Amino acid sequence: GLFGAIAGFIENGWEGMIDGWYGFRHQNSEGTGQAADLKSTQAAIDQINGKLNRVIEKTNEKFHQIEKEFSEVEGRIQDLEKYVEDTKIDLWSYNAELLVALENQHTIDLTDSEMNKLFEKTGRQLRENAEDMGNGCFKIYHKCDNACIESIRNGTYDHDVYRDEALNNRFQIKGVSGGGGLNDI
Amino acid sequence: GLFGAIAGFIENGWEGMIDGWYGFRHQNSEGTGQAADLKSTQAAIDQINGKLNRVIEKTNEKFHQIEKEFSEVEGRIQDLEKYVEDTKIDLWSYNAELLVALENQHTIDLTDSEMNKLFEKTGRQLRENAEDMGNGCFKIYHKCDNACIESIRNGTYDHDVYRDEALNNRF
Amino acid sequence: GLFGAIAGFIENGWEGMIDGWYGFRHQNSEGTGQAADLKSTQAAIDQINGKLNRVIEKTNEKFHQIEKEFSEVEGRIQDLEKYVEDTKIDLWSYNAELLVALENQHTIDLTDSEMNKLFEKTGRQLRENAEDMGNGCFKIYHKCDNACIESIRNGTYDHDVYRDEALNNRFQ
Amino acid sequence: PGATLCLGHHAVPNGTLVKTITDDQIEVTNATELVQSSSTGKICNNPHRILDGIDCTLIDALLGDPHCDVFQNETWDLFVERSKAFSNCYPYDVPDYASLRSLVASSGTLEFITEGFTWTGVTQNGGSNACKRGPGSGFFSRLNWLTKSGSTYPVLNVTMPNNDNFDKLYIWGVHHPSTNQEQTSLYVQASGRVTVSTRRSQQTIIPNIGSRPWVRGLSSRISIYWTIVKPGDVLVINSNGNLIAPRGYFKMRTGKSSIMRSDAPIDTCISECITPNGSIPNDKPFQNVNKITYGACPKYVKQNTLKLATGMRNVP
Amino acid sequence: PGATLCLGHHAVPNGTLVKTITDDQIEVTNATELVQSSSTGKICNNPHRILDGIDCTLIDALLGDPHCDVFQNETWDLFVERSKAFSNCYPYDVPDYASLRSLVASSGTLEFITEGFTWTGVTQNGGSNACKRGPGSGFFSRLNWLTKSGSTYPVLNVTMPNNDNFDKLYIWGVHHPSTNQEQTSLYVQASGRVTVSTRRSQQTIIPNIGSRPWVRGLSSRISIYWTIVKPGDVLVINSNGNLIAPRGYFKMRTGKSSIMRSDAPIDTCISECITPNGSIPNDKPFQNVNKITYGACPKYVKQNTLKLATGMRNVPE
Amino acid sequence: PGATLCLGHHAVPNGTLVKTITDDQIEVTNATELVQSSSTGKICNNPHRILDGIDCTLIDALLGDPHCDVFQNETWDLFVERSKAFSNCYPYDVPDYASLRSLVASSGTLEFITEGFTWTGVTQNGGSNACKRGPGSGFFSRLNWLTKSGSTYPVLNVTMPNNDNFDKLYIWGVHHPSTNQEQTSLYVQASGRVTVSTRRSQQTIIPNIGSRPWVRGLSSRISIYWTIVKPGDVLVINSNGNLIAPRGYFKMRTGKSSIMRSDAPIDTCISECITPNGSIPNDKPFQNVNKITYGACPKYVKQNTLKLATGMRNVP
Amino acid sequence: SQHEKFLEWMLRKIEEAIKRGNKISAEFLINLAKNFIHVLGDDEIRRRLERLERQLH
Amino acid sequence: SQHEKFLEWMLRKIEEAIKRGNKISAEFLINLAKNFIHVLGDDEIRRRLERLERQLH
Ligand SMILES: *[C@@H]1O[C@H](CO)[C@@H](O[C@@H]2O[C@H](CO)[C@@H](O[C@@H]3O[C@H](CO)[C@@H](O)[C@H](O)[C@@H]3O)[C@H](O)[C@H]2NC(C)=O)[C@H](O)[C@H]1NC(C)=O
Ligand SMILES: *[C@@H]1O[C@H](CO)[C@@H](O[C@@H]2O[C@H](CO)[C@@H](O[C@@H]3O[C@H](CO)[C@@H](O)[C@H](O)[C@@H]3O)[C@H](O)[C@H]2NC(C)=O)[C@H](O)[C@H]1NC(C)=O
Ligand SMILES: *[C@@H]1O[C@H](CO)[C@@H](O[C@@H]2O[C@H](CO)[C@@H](O)[C@H](O)[C@H]2NC(C)=O)[C@H](O)[C@H]1NC(C)=O
Ligand SMILES: *[C@@H]1O[C@H](CO)[C@@H](O[C@@H]2O[C@H](CO)[C@@H](O)[C@H](O)[C@H]2NC(C)=O)[C@H](O)[C@H]1NC(C)=O
Ligand SMILES: *[C@@H]1O[C@H](CO)[C@@H](O[C@@H]2O[C@H](CO)[C@@H](O)[C@H](O)[C@H]2NC(C)=O)[C@H](O)[C@H]1NC(C)=O
Ligand SMILES: *[C@@H]1O[C@H](CO)[C@@H](O[C@@H]2O[C@H](CO)[C@@H](O)[C@H](O)[C@H]2NC(C)=O)[C@H](O)[C@H]1NC(C)=O
Ligand SMILES: *[C@@H]1O[C@H](CO)[C@@H](O[C@@H]2O[C@H](CO)[C@@H](O)[C@H](O)[C@H]2NC(C)=O)[C@H](O)[C@H]1NC(C)=O
Ligand SMILES: *[C@@H]1O[C@H](CO)[C@@H](O)[C@H](O)[C@H]1NC(C)=O
Ligand SMILES: *[C@@H]1O[C@H](CO)[C@@H](O)[C@H](O)[C@H]1NC(C)=O
Ligand SMILES: *[C@@H]1O[C@H](CO)[C@@H](O)[C@H](O)[C@H]1NC(C)=O
Ligand SMILES: *[C@@H]1O[C@H](CO)[C@@H](O)[C@H](O)[C@H]1NC(C)=O
Ligand SMILES: *[C@@H]1O[C@H](CO)[C@@H](O)[C@H](O)[C@H]1NC(C)=O
């Protein structure tokens, strides 16, 4: 894809994800979990259904036309009729081929875009409390139970509440003594 | 859009913007202000005007053709003439529809791209002195008067000058 | 381009790069160096070659057709034949023009995309040990010899090894 | 004291291959077919009024062939001609047969109005044993075989005005005998002549005497011609021999009527699109069944399959 | 202590709906129309030279109908036939009328060169009261009605060579009478025949005697035929009766000339594109006025409106 | 301390300009031509079987013009007619010449089978000085000039059945004399008549007497007509004067055969696509050489150049 | 400076559109310039834009 | 091993282009491979490329 998410930094899809197209997988103190995101899935499905309805819109109704099969050789006029029909067929075949190619390319690109947009939205939400690991996963540097992941998955995550603990766990000089956490109370 | 800026993390447009297509709104110790960015506006206008010139290029001149309306029934030759003209009309109608659809999709996508690129450039300028708030706004963690906002908006911002103050206010 | 790398935050190309399309230039204690990245070059070449194979696919073979040049004036039937041929020619000219235009736009956009993807991949590799200078260059905040540059350029770079030194050099 | 939050997308075990601009075969999660390549094999009787000719062509029913008498005053949306169709009347040929067939099919009706033509001095209602009506000889129901009365064939001069608000279609004919003895015994004069004219059009036919192959016992022929008379115009028939006269006119219509050659049977269903292979659905924008179509039809293409991707890239 | 820097785009109070690949209706800041759907209703006399037939078809001016004698030796880029045009001469018919009309219109000129045809033993300049030229009888100006001289009709054999550098168009005719009395009174012989021939083409017409419907007081007809003689070839006319002889040739030309049926008035303006509805602008790429066009015209499409987006998505407050 | 790692892309000294959707001329690193605009000027004799007519048109070789006697029983994939071609026999014309030329070119063969037509009571093998064959007068090798025998011309009535599994093409003619003396001295009767008929078709030609321009010393003409007889059908010839009779039939075939007007010389090479300008390569999808093409050809376009970008933006 | 450069490149493009016969694009750029001209500040651009607007219909 | 793998995959795609009748793509890939060949360093890749260049209609 143009955006490098699908078949990019995300290694592969999740055959277990059956209730959505994009979603989250989490592993915290309470264990592991998976949950679909309905906004991005709805947006992708909406665009695909729009292009599908646009393509299959019934717009051709013809009645009396010209003859296209002949039982006797006639020459000039029959040559012209056959040539007209052949030209029309070739042009419509080219149109159909080009249409399906462009539409499939655009569908792939827009799905890649939706994945990338969800990733960036989550990162901007997490702010300075997490780090991008480069494989579509965020390393969160604070205690985040199932309710915290739920608050992340519905946009209500408040970064300032955890910012101090996140910074304390993040910027540690482990090589020096006392570079870890501040134990003064 | 494919890039998620317009109608994305940017909540809505500014009907007050009248001297540009993209721009900055700032709020600092001196108050509030707004100023358009001319480079991205020029880029978008260039692309749109280029596709306009490509679309409206005069390339059709026909003179003596065939008859297309008839007063008497004749049969085979008239059938062929009508069929040819109908085929031509249908093919050009399909071409026009597909053209306008593709061009409009690309226009929306390229405007979204220009907005996202301006955001990315501002973010790279600010370096470690600011943070992305997720709604198209940067929170700057140091004193930034109107002259500092101007230096940001014209590319001359020097981050190391304020880096120490910004780090002190951030962490 | 849509991604703003080529002719964007990347100032210009490198005429010295002859063994690849995208690559790295590094400056460290040992000096300067240049090396192409082959994965992005391979991806771009594959997309362009697929486009080429799709476009130039031989799919037209016609034999007995209609007459297209005439020596005497005849009228209605000759008018119809000339009109049919002219319509076909105009439609195919339009198809070819639109095809080449769309393909070139897509080519430029996808090359820009490959450059941007390589940049983002290198940035995600570097993690918190470096900073984006805004001009396609990364400022690395630790000592990084030729072996370290090689480890960055072949994907085996380990950020935790240098994280302590890098954080110490970054935040004052 | 941390957690991991991973972003991802869904996948399927068996995706579907589609074409793009840059790749000839790429796997996606779902796709849909855009080319209709199969037909039921039957023509649906609704919503279009389908008229099955069985053993008659449109021209034979137009003229009034005996075994086509069931097609009198018939209307249709699509006339279906079968390959088993045969002629069983007077051997005839139609100059510009295709144009007459096309215009009658586009009119979509065989509604025939009888006019009181006055043929003074000739014998009417002639018949032949190649065009049997029941056990005995007959003729085209819409044509009148005029021959000598007593021993003279006068110069027939008949006029018929069009005082209606629609066009009139007249079908007439010219008999070509096989010998001069037949010509003289039927029409007195050694060479006939038929002239059918309007105010701005005219047609003059001279019979041709000679032996043709034996078709249904005869080596004589009939040439069929047609004439359209507009409102306010007048049809004039001037003939001194060999005239196969009209009995009236056919009313001309304009509409969505047409004709199709097919051997598919007619079934009870609803389908807007008919091809010689049968009725096909119009849900897909394209079709690979037959280039001959009627109704709200998918466009014919050369490709037998064109898959439109309706999902993302399948990465297992 | 600090400041906030927000990025954003502009918007408008009233947007415009356009089609896309994905959405059937999406709002953008501005758009432009690509389908020309209106016409002024008048045909501009420039840059194309327009010749209005008023009350004359092209065939009538070609043959030389009396009330059409104003278009003699005329040229045009687009000939406009009205619906009011009428015929006021001898009742005639042209087998393959459309082809003659098309070739004369594409030639774009009615320049007639008179030739001294040698008619030995026949009465020239025959006329009729159904084709009045002035107070008395007349005939087509480019045709000569040859009749009896004395009481015999000779077998006319006339030749005319093409020694010029251009093609020649000859219009001739055959007279179809109504009764044998008229035939024998005008052309002596009981059955006539006309043969117009070149080296590679021949055209023989036998007159047909019979009563047609009454048109302008006559039950007789004229059949009009045409023959093109190339440089170096020869026209040969061999007739033994009912010949409506030519008087000369028409200079055939090749160019951008055409013909159009229209009832719109002709105005003094400039417009490259003309339709039967009038002159339309050529700035838009498509048009929905009429499929009949002439000149630098937009391409006809079925859509009445197609809006091309000229701005970004309109996201108001 | 520290290091700098810069990302970049390649560039070239001399890029190439291409067209896009948004820019009319933009510089990329390299591009390729998609329109074939040049030809060698020669027609390749392979893979298509090319038959050069030199000085003969297809119709003259069909009829049997003297200097065309080499083209008997010849086959082709593409017949090449030259501009120097001339007729050197009896002056003739073919009503609907284009259709006969087209159907013979599409058949792709001049294989002629002689049938034993029995003309009892007429003089056969007539000749003329405008069609010299050797020291004496001659005629078309595939036609038979029938004239009077003694002082009578009977009503010739000959039948020929098609008992094969292929169609038969019969070429015949009608002689138009220049004077009534010529007509009476050749065919006795004052007016001739030719009628060629099948079971469902018939054609009757009446000769036309008159002076035509002088072609090779003659003012008389011959009109050429064709008749196709299907398997099981029968050809009937009935003529009382001026008949130029057929000597047999041509076998009809269907395939990829055609005809082309060109003055390009033939050469020994391989090229799938032929134009009147010569053979062209089919590597590019489009071509600007000639709208007249034969074979596996690029599609004709009006543009003489279309550059497809094969590289990124060239930014020096 | 910057505003002047934007309007001047715009005027150059309007001149090209006029000198190529493309009226829709000329109108597009002219409308955009007629909304971007800072009234009382760039009268020269206004006058040249009016001049280029005259060479159009 | 990386440069070698890139050039060998290039040769494989050239072979497919030859075995499909598409000559423009074969020329494209051949020119690019002849531009990526490390002059003074490799000769076997050059020989295989020359062999595939000979087999080219
Ligand atoms: C992925 O795309 C495929 C099509 O390629 C979808 O399969 C088809 O889905 C339609 C529903 O739109 C099914 O149609 C239904 O069929 C029944 C039985 O004939 C009929 O009674 C209904 O009225 C309706 O037409 C169809 O059966 C099904 N399969 C096939 C072979 O066409 C599939 O649903 C798509 N999957 C997703 C997740 O979107
Ligand atoms: C330009 O002029 C042409 C020719 O006059 C116009 O086309 C014709 O317009 C008439 C109406 O003035 C149409 O007649 C109508 O047809 C409908 C069919 O549903 C019928 O219901 C009405 O009672 C009436 O008879 C006619 O069909 C139409 N012909 C064609 C081929 O479209 C055309 O509309 C004019 N366009 C403009 C922009 O002025
Ligand atoms: C990727 O780059 C690393 C650079 O760190 C390579 O590791 C070096 O390999 C060479 C050759 O085997 C050794 O001499 C060095 O001692 C290695 N350095 C280190 C730090 O391990 C590595 O071989 C490259 N390739 C792969 C596939 O990892
Ligand atoms: C629909 O019917 C047509 C016949 O009208 C079929 O076309 C024929 O198909 C056979 C088998 O491939 C060929 O041998 C014939 O040459 C074809 N004839 C024509 C005129 O094309 C067609 O295959 C049928 N389609 C379907 C889907 O049944
Ligand atoms: C663009 O592609 C063409 C492909 O033909 C290149 O021309 C070839 O260049 C190679 C390498 O120098 C030569 O071996 C061939 O003989 C050339 N073929 C020709 C000239 O027909 C051309 O160099 C490419 N341009 C750029 C800028 O890379
Ligand atoms: C192919 O040959 C044709 C002639 O058969 C060339 O057409 C001529 O082109 C010139 C230059 O444009 C014109 O002046 C002539 O009027 C054309 N003649 C005809 C009959 O069209 C054509 O240019 C040739 N094409 C190539 C690529 O050589
Ligand atoms: C969309 O762009 C068009 C460009 O033509 C604008 O229409 C012009 O607007 C100017 C305003 O200064 C007028 O002077 C012109 O007369 C208008 N031209 C036409 C043909 O109407 C239009 O205003 C723009 N729409 C929006 C919402 O900005
Ligand atoms: C056909 O219908 C018309 C309706 O006006 C009727 O007058 C006529 O008698 C009908 N003809 C037959 C043969 O039923
Ligand atoms: C035939 O009848 C019409 C009726 O108007 C008449 O005008 C015409 O003269 C008649 N013809 C003959 C030859 O009697
Ligand atoms: C028409 O032009 C020709 C040539 O200029 C001239 O001889 C002739 O007199 C003019 N008028 C007519 C009526 O032919
Ligand atoms: C007609 O006149 C021409 C010219 O002199 C002559 O060649 C031809 O033989 C004549 N035809 C006759 C007299 O039948
Ligand atoms: C002509 O020959 C055919 C042979 O079948 C025969 O039927 C027919 O009666 C013959 N005609 C004459 C007039 O002899």
Author numbering:
A (entry chain D): 1 to 185
B (entry chain F): 1 to 171
C (entry chain B): 1 to 172
D (entry chain C), F (entry chain A): 9 to 324
E (entry chain E): 9 to 325
G (entry chain H), H (entry chain G): 1 to 57
Please give sentences taken from the publication describing this entry:
We succeeded in solving crystal structures of five of the binder–target complexes, and all five closely match the corresponding computational design models.
The design of proteins that bind to a specific site on the surface of a target protein using no information other than the three-dimensional structure of the target remains a challenge. Here we describe a general solution to this problem that starts with a broad exploration of the vast space of possible binding modes to a selected region of a protein surface, and then intensifies the search in the vicinity of the most promising binding modes. We demonstrate the broad applicability of this approach through the de novo design of binding proteins to 12 diverse protein targets with different shapes and surface properties. Biophysical characterization shows that the binders, which are all smaller than 65 amino acids, are hyperstable and, following experimental optimization, bind their targets with nanomolar to picomolar affinities.
